[PDB]
Amino acid sequence: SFVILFVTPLLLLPPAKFVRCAYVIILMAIYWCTEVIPLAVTSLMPVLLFPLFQILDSRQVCVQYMKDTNMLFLGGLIVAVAVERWNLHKRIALRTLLWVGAKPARLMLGFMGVTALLSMWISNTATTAMMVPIVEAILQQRKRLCKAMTLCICYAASIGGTATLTGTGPNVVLLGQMNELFPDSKDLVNFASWFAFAFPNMLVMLLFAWLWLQFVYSKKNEKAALKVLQEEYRKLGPLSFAEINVLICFFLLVILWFSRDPTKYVSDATVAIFVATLLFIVPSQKPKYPPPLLDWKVTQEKVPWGIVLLLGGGFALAKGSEASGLSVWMGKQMEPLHAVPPAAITLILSLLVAVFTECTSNVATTTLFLPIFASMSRSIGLNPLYIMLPCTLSASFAFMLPVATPPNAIVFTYGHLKVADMVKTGVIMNIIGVFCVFLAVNTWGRAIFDLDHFPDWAN
Amino acid sequence: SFVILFVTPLLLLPPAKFVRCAYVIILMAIYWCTEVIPLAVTSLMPVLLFPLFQILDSRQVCVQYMKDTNMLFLGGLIVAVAVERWNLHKRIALRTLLWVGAKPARLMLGFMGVTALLSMWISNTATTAMMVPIVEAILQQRKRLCKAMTLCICYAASIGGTATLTGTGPNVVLLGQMNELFPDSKDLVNFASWFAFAFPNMLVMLLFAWLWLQFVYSKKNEKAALKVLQEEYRKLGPLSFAEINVLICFFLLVILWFSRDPTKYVSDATVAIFVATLLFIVPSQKPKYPPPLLDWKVTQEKVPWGIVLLLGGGFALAKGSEASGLSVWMGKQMEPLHAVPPAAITLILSLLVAVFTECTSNVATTTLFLPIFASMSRSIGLNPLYIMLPCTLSASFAFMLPVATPPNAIVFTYGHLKVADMVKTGVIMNIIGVFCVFLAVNTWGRAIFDLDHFPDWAN
């Protein structure tokens, strides 16, 4: 019940400041998992508790909630709001679905592919909420096929969100934790490098996921799917001037992100804010002044400020833990794990994170786990990325339960899925994702991020 | 037109870093006044421009957008959302209106008083939006009386918002500018001290405003007003458990604010966040688990995150100006004003700010003006509060034009008001407010804030 979770851990107070910080983290973790209070409200607990426990005064805690990574996430959110408002993502989805065809194998392949590619830029929740209605329309016009198609949308959304830093919350958590715990790693992880590392990983995950879904689960079926796609495309209207401007702004954002990383004042957040500002200036109609692509009302009602506060609370947790000496204590405690082969450590941690994300939020899960893993990596003399990147990717492997991530809840809202089918498919999804992420980290992740050597920024 | 304001100042680039910061500030000021892009989007321009002009890199700029004052404002906003959601503010308004009576003089007095007291805690926009419908209902059940009653609601809302730090945006701007420009002034300005200084000032403004409105502008009229108030009170329902809990949480917030100021880790933001968190825990119904007073959905859709970003942009402007050496340059330039008597300087500045707020947002106006006035005060060896407090109070004196502040727009949305009547009444409002604020700053503001001496935190 809520009462036992609300009251009992809060009254655990009877020590050292690192013990108080560990208590704050454990209480926040319990509130993350149990959802007794909202995620953003839980993320505000550092402001409440660190001054009370004298870890950081209110000024230090409050200045941790908006940062470079948080601003980059906000800019990406604004761009995503612009894309969703002018209905460009559905246009891309329908165009690519028409291009790939409608035969059931390639139909599922195209659905998973477009969901993954759109989830790189649009949020996984929004991508799933847009894509599932098309699946429902096609199915209405086999039970195994229905459940496979419902699962594939959320599975591909979760996989594709990992490909870009702004694609999913755990990636932004990883970037913020890298800047907090390892400040000397100046933009080593960025949009270009993270893309170069995760997009092939995302493609491998998508291919193996599609293969497994074909394993576990035709003319007029193709004709019905084509009819549905064409009818959905006709009501979309002609490619409008606003959609063209949004696409141009998005392409400019992508080009500036990938070109910035082929003193350094300009970062990825600067590019995101630049394009977001342009979205409030670029007209939505031909002048023949026409309204801009975005106004502050829709940006206000559509931006998930709760996730921004969640990221800020994660950064405040990192700051309080680093200042209070908790991270040093954890590193000293679990350095006797320097006897294990790093590969086995990565496999075990990825499996544990993938399992743990089935019960709680991906962003909260990676927020809780990344400081511990970074302390381990610093203690055992291993590259922090070599641990954090696979664990950050595994934080998005919410495949077993509908309550694991909002895309699973969205797909489970429809009646084609039961809990049992989802858990049987999701265990193999978790194993496949862990294997693919392991292979990527051990094969081309090493070249991109220099995982073979202990970096200087890890001390 | 928008095009000339969009393009021409942006292309002014052909110098010294302080010149570039001054250019950024001037461009932001033009965008504040002209409203070419939204206020929050304009507040994000430091992130775009300071890295481009090499004043501050993206990490320094982005960390300025959430701070102690911004968190306190957010907590107060959450508490206000809780009050508005459970319809407690309307209950207080109707109860006090029934208590004061319905005779036209005391009717207007009670309306102005309750609007001022509610605007201390609820936002001026929300207070006006709640209060004007009661006025309309009473009037429906003399043209001069109608226009007087419509003006008085927004006038009292603007006056009452000054009484508390969270009452209006300019006060939060003043607190943030005090922490930015004068870091050594540890919580010299706080909720308790600002209340002790401004609540008598607010009362004097309210009394003189009511007197002037009676100057420029009965049984069954009283009976109709009483009938309207009673009927509005009956549909409100009995005092519910949720309203009692919200009132208790509000009283706890007020008590903790006033008792904290009869190392220092706990601040007013800590109290605001504590009460806001309690609003997500305290039940809204008798357990007989019942839903809490707040959930994150309504808090998300009701909190003005745009104003939070506006405050953050103001803090980033202050940081970039202080770092770039612009403030030193302005102080050196306008120290030849050390020949004027401080009282004349305060009168002139208060008049200029009160006039300038008629054309642009109060928050933007005080954001633009406070750094210049602080630089003046530092240069001429005068207490910065002795200049900033009257100017911060005058920033809320939006009385002449409907476009000056959202309360004026709300009251002007109804047809009882024309622009001419509003400007004639508002010029005398501005003069009266400037005089009252001058008297308060020179009589009891000196005792509270030690305005007679140049403080050490002003260097």
Side-chain angles (χ1 to χ4, degrees):
Chain A
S1 64
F2 288 179
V3 186
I4 193 66
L5 303 166
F6 267 124
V7 181
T8 305
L10 193 64
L11 292 182
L12 187 63
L13 300 175
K17 63 180 175 183
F18 84 87
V19 186
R20 305 194 294 253
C21 196
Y23 165 81
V24 171
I25 279 158
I26 289 159
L27 187 57
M28 284 186 70
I30 294 160
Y31 295 179
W32 294 120
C33 297
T34 61
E35 294 294 328
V36 292
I37 59 181
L39 294 166
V41 188
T42 308
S43 13
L44 286 168
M45 293 177 70
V47 177
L48 195 155
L49 286 175
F50 284 162
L52 291 182
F53 294 129
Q54 304 192 6
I55 294 146
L56 292 169
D57 63 270
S58 196
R59 272 156 65 166
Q60 318 179 264
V61 190
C62 295
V63 76
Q64 306 302 318
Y65 280 63
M66 185 64 72
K67 292 219 164 195
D68 210 349
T69 66
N70 218 359
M71 198 66 83
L72 162 63
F73 181 66
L74 176 63
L77 288 175
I78 293 159
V79 177
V81 171
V83 179
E84 301 147 12
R85 180 190 185 179
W86 298 107
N87 189 359
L88 173 69
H89 63 281
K90 197 161 189 272
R91 189 173 292 280
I92 292 165
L94 287 164
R95 178 71 274 172
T96 314
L97 285 170
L98 291 174
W99 170 58
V100 300
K103 297 182 182 179
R106 56 175 53 256
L107 178 79
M108 183 185 315
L109 168 53
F111 266 97
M112 300 193 52
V114 303
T115 307
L117 303 167
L118 287 173
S119 295
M120 307 175 59
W121 322 108
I122 314 305
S123 73
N124 289 337
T125 299
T127 313
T128 307
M130 183 268 297
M131 285 288 301
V132 182
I134 313 169
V135 174
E136 294 293 328
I138 288 182
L139 293 175
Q140 286 172 9
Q141 181 62 255
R142 190 64 177 142
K143 291 182 181 291
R144 293 178 77 194
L145 181 68
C146 291
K147 54 175 45 71
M149 294 299 291
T150 50
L151 285 178
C152 83
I153 302 306
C154 73
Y155 279 20
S158 302
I159 290 164
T162 66
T164 49
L165 275 188
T166 62
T168 194
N171 302 345
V172 179
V173 176
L174 170 69
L175 190 69
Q177 290 304 323
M178 277 294 283
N179 300 117
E180 285 301 302
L181 294 174
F182 308 109
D184 293 352
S185 74
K186 301 188 303 289
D187 72 295
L188 169 62
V189 181
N190 61 67
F191 208 97
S193 63
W194 175 264
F195 182 91
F197 162 70
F199 184 73
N201 190 317
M202 188 275 303
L203 288 182
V204 172
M205 286 188 267
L206 197 54
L207 169 64
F208 285 39
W210 167 62
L211 289 172
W212 175 246
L213 287 170
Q214 284 284 126
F215 176 77
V216 288
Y217 310 112
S218 62
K219 304 294 187 178
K220 68 181 178 67
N221 281 324
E222 174 208 321
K223 300 289 94 175
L226 285 173
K227 184 206 299 180
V228 170
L229 292 172
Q230 291 175 356
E231 183 172 20
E232 294 293 328
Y233 200 65
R234 290 278 72 75
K235 305 185 279 169
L236 201 67
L239 174 65
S240 67
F241 188 72
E243 293 179 353
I244 293 160
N245 285 348
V246 170
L247 188 63
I248 286 164
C249 290
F250 176 89
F251 270 125
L252 177 70
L253 174 71
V254 169
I255 285 160
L256 289 171
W257 271 335
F258 284 143
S259 62
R260 199 207 71 111
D261 295 290
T263 62
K264 188 61 58 178
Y265 286 89
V266 177
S267 71
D268 300 272
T270 310
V271 163
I273 294 305
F274 177 58
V275 179
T277 305
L278 287 175
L279 293 161
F280 294 95
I281 303 164
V282 170
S284 64
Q285 299 184 320
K286 274 283 188 179
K288 296 177 183 178
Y289 201 69
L293 294 173
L294 283 183
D295 59 345
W296 187 248
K297 186 184 180 74
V298 67
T299 306
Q300 183 65 328
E301 53 200 33
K302 295 296 188 174
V303 159
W305 308 97
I307 308 178
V308 179
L309 288 172
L310 176 47
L311 293 161
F315 310 147
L317 273 186
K319 184 71 179 179
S321 305
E322 183 65 13
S324 61
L326 175 63
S327 297
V328 167
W329 177 84
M330 310 204 289
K332 281 175 159 65
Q333 283 288 101
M334 65 180 288
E335 174 273 359
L337 177 63
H338 182 197
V340 168
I345 301 177
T346 61
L347 294 174
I348 290 163
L349 295 180
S350 304
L351 280 161
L352 302 166
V353 171
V355 170
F356 203 92
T357 189
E358 308 299 332
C359 309
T360 178
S361 158
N362 311 323
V363 184
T365 314
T366 177
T367 298
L368 295 173
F369 276 123
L370 281 192
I372 307 163
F373 298 159
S375 296
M376 188 209 314
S377 309
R378 183 177 292 171
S379 75
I380 67 178
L382 181 62
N383 193 303
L385 284 176
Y386 185 89
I387 299 295
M388 293 177 71
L389 301 166
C391 294
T392 302
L393 295 170
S394 299
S396 310
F397 296 167
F399 296 131
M400 293 180 183
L401 299 176
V403 300
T405 195
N408 288 61
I410 291 161
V411 297
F412 185 76
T413 307
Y414 300 80
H416 299 296
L417 296 174
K418 285 186 177 179
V419 184
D421 316 320
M422 184 172 297
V423 301
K424 291 159 275 268
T425 317
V427 68
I428 292 300
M429 293 296 137
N430 283 51
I431 297 165
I432 278 160
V434 166
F435 164 65
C436 296
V437 161
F438 191 70
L439 178 69
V441 167
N442 285 278
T443 51
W444 64 82
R446 316 210 332 275
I448 294 164
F449 291 112
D450 195 4
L451 306 180
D452 268 2
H453 304 92
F454 191 56
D456 291 331
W457 48 258
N459 297 330
Chain B
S1 64
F2 288 179
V3 186
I4 193 66
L5 303 166
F6 267 124
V7 181
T8 305
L10 193 64
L11 292 182
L12 187 62
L13 300 175
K17 63 180 175 183
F18 84 87
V19 186
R20 305 194 294 253
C21 196
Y23 165 81
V24 170
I25 279 158
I26 289 159
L27 187 57
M28 284 186 70
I30 294 160
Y31 295 179
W32 294 120
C33 297
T34 61
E35 294 294 328
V36 292
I37 59 181
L39 294 166
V41 188
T42 308
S43 13
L44 286 168
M45 293 177 70
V47 177
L48 195 155
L49 286 175
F50 284 162
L52 291 182
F53 294 129
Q54 304 192 6
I55 294 146
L56 292 169
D57 63 270
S58 196
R59 272 156 65 166
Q60 318 179 264
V61 189
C62 295
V63 76
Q64 306 302 318
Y65 280 63
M66 185 64 72
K67 292 219 164 195
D68 209 349
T69 66
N70 218 358
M71 198 66 83
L72 162 63
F73 181 66
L74 176 63
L77 288 175
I78 293 159
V79 177
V81 171
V83 179
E84 301 147 12
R85 179 190 185 179
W86 298 107
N87 189 359
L88 173 69
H89 63 281
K90 197 161 189 272
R91 189 173 292 280
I92 292 165
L94 287 164
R95 178 71 274 172
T96 314
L97 285 170
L98 291 174
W99 170 58
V100 300
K103 297 182 182 179
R106 56 175 53 256
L107 178 79
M108 183 185 315
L109 168 53
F111 266 97
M112 300 193 52
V114 303
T115 307
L117 303 167
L118 287 173
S119 295
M120 307 175 59
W121 322 108
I122 314 305
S123 73
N124 289 337
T125 299
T127 313
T128 307
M130 183 268 297
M131 285 288 301
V132 182
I134 313 169
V135 174
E136 294 293 328
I138 288 183
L139 293 175
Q140 286 172 9
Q141 180 62 255
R142 190 63 177 142
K143 291 182 181 291
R144 293 178 77 194
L145 181 68
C146 291
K147 54 175 45 71
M149 294 299 291
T150 50
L151 285 178
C152 83
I153 302 305
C154 73
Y155 279 20
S158 302
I159 290 164
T162 66
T164 49
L165 275 188
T166 62
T168 194
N171 302 345
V172 179
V173 176
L174 170 69
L175 190 69
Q177 291 304 323
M178 277 294 283
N179 300 117
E180 285 301 302
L181 294 174
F182 308 109
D184 293 352
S185 74
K186 301 188 303 289
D187 72 295
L188 169 62
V189 181
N190 60 67
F191 208 97
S193 63
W194 175 264
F195 182 91
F197 162 70
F199 184 73
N201 190 317
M202 188 275 303
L203 288 182
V204 172
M205 286 188 267
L206 197 54
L207 169 64
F208 285 39
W210 167 62
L211 289 172
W212 175 246
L213 287 170
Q214 284 284 126
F215 176 77
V216 288
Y217 310 112
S218 62
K219 304 294 187 178
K220 68 181 178 67
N221 281 324
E222 174 208 321
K223 300 289 94 175
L226 285 173
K227 184 206 299 180
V228 170
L229 292 172
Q230 291 175 356
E231 183 172 20
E232 294 293 328
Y233 200 65
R234 290 278 72 75
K235 305 185 279 169
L236 201 67
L239 174 65
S240 67
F241 188 72
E243 293 179 353
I244 293 160
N245 285 348
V246 170
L247 188 63
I248 286 164
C249 290
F250 176 89
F251 270 125
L252 177 70
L253 174 71
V254 169
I255 285 161
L256 289 171
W257 271 335
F258 284 143
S259 62
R260 199 207 71 111
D261 295 290
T263 62
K264 188 61 58 178
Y265 286 89
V266 177
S267 71
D268 300 272
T270 310
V271 163
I273 294 305
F274 176 58
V275 179
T277 305
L278 287 175
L279 293 161
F280 294 95
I281 303 164
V282 170
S284 64
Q285 299 184 320
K286 274 283 188 179
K288 296 177 183 178
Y289 201 69
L293 294 173
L294 283 183
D295 59 345
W296 187 248
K297 186 184 180 74
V298 67
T299 306
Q300 183 65 328
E301 53 200 33
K302 295 296 188 174
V303 159
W305 308 97
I307 308 178
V308 179
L309 288 172
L310 176 47
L311 293 161
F315 310 147
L317 273 186
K319 184 71 179 179
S321 305
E322 183 65 13
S324 61
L326 175 63
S327 297
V328 167
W329 177 84
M330 310 204 289
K332 281 175 159 65
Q333 283 288 101
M334 65 180 288
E335 174 273 359
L337 177 63
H338 182 197
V340 168
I345 301 177
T346 61
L347 294 174
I348 290 163
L349 295 180
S350 304
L351 280 161
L352 302 166
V353 171
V355 170
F356 203 92
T357 189
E358 308 299 332
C359 309
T360 178
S361 158
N362 311 323
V363 184
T365 314
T366 177
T367 298
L368 295 173
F369 276 123
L370 281 192
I372 307 163
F373 298 159
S375 296
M376 188 209 314
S377 309
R378 183 177 292 171
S379 75
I380 67 178
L382 182 63
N383 193 303
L385 284 176
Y386 185 89
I387 299 295
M388 293 177 71
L389 301 166
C391 294
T392 302
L393 295 170
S394 299
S396 310
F397 296 167
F399 296 131
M400 293 180 183
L401 300 176
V403 300
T405 195
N408 288 61
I410 291 161
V411 297
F412 185 77
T413 307
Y414 300 80
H416 299 296
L417 296 174
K418 285 186 177 179
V419 184
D421 316 320
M422 184 172 297
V423 301
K424 291 159 275 268
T425 317
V427 68
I428 292 300
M429 293 296 137
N430 283 51
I431 297 165
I432 278 160
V434 166
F435 164 65
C436 296
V437 161
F438 191 70
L439 178 69
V441 167
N442 285 277
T443 51
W444 64 82
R446 316 210 332 275
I448 294 164
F449 291 112
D450 195 4
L451 306 180
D452 268 2
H453 304 92
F454 191 56
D456 291 331
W457 48 258
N459 297 330

